[PDB]
Ligand binder design. Structure first.
Ligand SMILES: *[C@H]1O[C@H](CO)[C@@H](O[C@H]2O[C@H](CO)[C@@H](O[C@@H]3O[C@H](CO)[C@@H](O)[C@H](O)[C@@H]3O)[C@H](O)[C@H]2NC(C)=O)[C@H](O)[C@H]1NC(C)=O
Ligand code: NAG
Lengths: 372, 101
């Protein structure tokens, strides 16, 4: 029972309601605790510090803190701003860093102690192109909300010079309701293949709009790049005869996957949901799944590195951790079945470029698989 | 201590200093353009460098004055997208076909 701690960082409600990532992480540590098949001779505790959103200095101090007690590695906050702080901390003091949310890849950041289980945007976007190419649409239209969606689709944006197409680009304005006039001009625009890069919450806040202006008829077809396509409040709209298509690395075929899903669903509406928002209560989200998997890959590596030690280091003792060399390499080289399927780490840019994707579509009944 | 600070050139590294000065009230000035995140509430930072937003408006004006009917945009790294988003939104308003490499 080798004791170990994992740094926990959560940009959260800063209030009573507890966030999903903390939940899945603790769910994860419990999962370790019950099944000893992984780590028969080892059990890992954890320290979970909590910070504010888009607030670097506070995160950095907390980073020094979870250094003070010592762990193997941190779990990155889910927003890039302080994420950069975290990363420039980790590789600065040698402790491997694991990230879940996509960050803006800085082209020349020579950091080396980081990976990201998130489906890297490039592969996703390439699949997007293959998909739209199959459906033989021409006047496609993107709508994002903030800046980084364009980046997520850059591979999409560069397509026209090789592929005969067109696409205007339209913006959801600052607040969600503001999208009604956008739908107005799109109605004027008559753009019948509009792909969306947007947070599924905003997807909900705009589907009410689209049905409200009656735009959802059988001609229109939308494809939603987001990965929590599962928990959409699908039921009323599927009888608008519309066509939707999307992806889900979130496997459901494994019965173990299911069983863990219902265990979650017991612990999940345990947290008070927002049914008024129009989200299907009782379904764990893609990010939380990712960060569940991440502890498991950490474990599936560490079990083979019992030489693990926890140097109680300080931010000002600039000499890095003693054992960040082989352990990080192990994570890079490890493979596992998480809750998304196959999992590995591309050794080229220290990221992930490999996974398995089921494309899913809105059938007459709801989300039903339409390929791999 | 300083009366205030001048910013470093990058975007990413600049973020941290911006925040730090906000954590103590220092006025922070910058020199290069970066992408602001629309979800930062901070106040003590200003940019001399002209924003690329208005630049895009001017470029669009120039395009239309020449009356171009086709164009190519080329950038260095994807950040140029953010740098040009306003122009990138040309087609919705006027008859402009633009492509990117
Ligand atoms: C880890 O995965 C990386 C991504 O697959 C891979 O890097 C790169 O190599 C592949 C080709 O195997 C490229 O993927 C395609 O490349 C062709 C052009 O050859 C494109 O037409 C196609 O659209 C697609 O992009 C990636 O572009 C390229 N990516 C990077 C990051 O450079 C690594 O080689 C691989 N390394 C291992 C084995 O760990
Ligand atoms: C929806 O998908 C079906 C099956 O591919 C297709 O027959 C139908 O024409 C599509 N409707 C549109 C135009 O969105």
């Amino acid at each position: 029972t080798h004791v170990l701690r994992f740094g926990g960082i959560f940009e959260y409600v800063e209030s009573g309601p507890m966030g999903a990532e903390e939940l899945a992480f603790r769910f994860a540590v419990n999962t370790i605790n019950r099944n000893r098949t992984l780590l028969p001779n080892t059990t890992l505790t954890y320290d979970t510090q909590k910070i504010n959103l888009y607030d670097s200095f506070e995160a950095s101090k907390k980073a020094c803190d979870q250094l003070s007690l010592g762990v193997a590695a941190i779990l990155g906050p889910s927003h890039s701003s302080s994420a950069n702080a975290v990363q420039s901390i980790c590789n600065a003091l040698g402790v491997p860093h694991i990230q879940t949310r996509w960050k803006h890849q800085v082209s020349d950041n020579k950091d080396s102690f980081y990976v990201s289980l998130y489906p890297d945007f490039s592969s996703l976007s390439r699949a997007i192109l293959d998909l739209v190419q199959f459906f033989k649409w021409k006047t496609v239209t993107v709508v994002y909300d903030d800046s980084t969606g364009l980046i997520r689709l850059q591979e999409l944006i560069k397509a026209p010079s090789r592929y005969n197409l067109r696409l205007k680009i339209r913006q959801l304005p600052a607040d969600t309701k503001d999208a009604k006039p956008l739908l107005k001009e799109m109605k004027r625009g008559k753009e019948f293949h509009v792909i969306f890069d947007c947070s599924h919450e905003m997807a909900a806040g705009i589907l009410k709009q689209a049905l409200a202006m009656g735009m959802m008829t059988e001609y229109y077809h939308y494809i939603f790049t987001t990965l929590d396509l599962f928990a959409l409040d699908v039921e009323p709209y599927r009888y608008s005869g519309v066509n939707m298509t999307g992806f889900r690395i979130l496997n459901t075929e494994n019965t173990q996957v299911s069983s863990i899903i219902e265990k979650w669903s017991m612990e999940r509406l345990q947290a008070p949901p927002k049914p008024d928002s129009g989200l299907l209560d009782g379904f764990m989200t893609t990010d939380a799944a990712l960060m569940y998997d991440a502890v498991h890959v950490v474990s599936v590596a560490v079990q083979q590195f019992p030489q693990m030690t926890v140097s109680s280091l300080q931010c000002n003792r600039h000499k890095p951790w003693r054992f960040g060399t082989r352990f990080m390499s192990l994570i890079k080289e490890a493979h596992w079945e998480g809750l998304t399927g196959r999992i590995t780490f591309n050794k080229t840019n220290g990221l992930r470029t490999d996974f398995d994707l089921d494309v899913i579509s809105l059938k007459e009944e709801g989300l039903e698989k339409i390929g791999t």
